[PDB]
């Protein structure tokens, strides 16, 4: 009927994120993304720690070639300039969303945008999927 499937999506917490300013510790939230539909959420911001705990979960309509994107930022950075305060990516194709769906929490290593960049990442987001 629908060409989606509702996959509720829990972004637990996320651990040992790179700390870029020596004196100054994070205040980190996650970004997720359906890639097809352009779906958009946010969670809370945690302040001032590299191991934020969210608890947030998502229902998410995911079509059938959508990828779901989870992206984490130091919200400190909100004013600097675009693409400050990245801290990592994790991008779920629809075969790994496929794979992960109903076999609870996973330990996801976060990524640069690209394995070729710069950036300093650090560390592991925690998500389920589950199919609703
Ligand atoms: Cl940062």
Redesign the pocket.
């Given at each position: 009927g629908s060409e989606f499937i509702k996959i509720r999506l829990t972004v637990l917490c996320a651990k040992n994120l790179?700390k870029?300013?020596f004196f100054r510790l994070?205040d980190p939230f996650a970004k997720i993304v359906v890639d097809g539909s352009g779906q958009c959420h946010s969670t809370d911001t945690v302040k001032n720690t590299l191991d934020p705990k969210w608890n947030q979960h998502y229902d998410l309509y995911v079509g059938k070639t959508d990828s779901i994107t989870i992206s984490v930022w130091?919200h400190?950075?909100i004013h600097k300039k675009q693409g400050?305060?990245?801290?990592g990516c994790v991008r779920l194709l629809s075969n790994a969303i496929s794979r992960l769906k109903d076999t609870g929490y996973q330990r996801l290593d976060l990524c640069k945008l690209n394995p070729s960049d710069t950036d300093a990442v650090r560390g592991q987001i925690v998500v389920s999927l589950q199919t609703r």
């Open positions: 790179a870029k300013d994070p130091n400190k950075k400050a305060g990245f801290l």
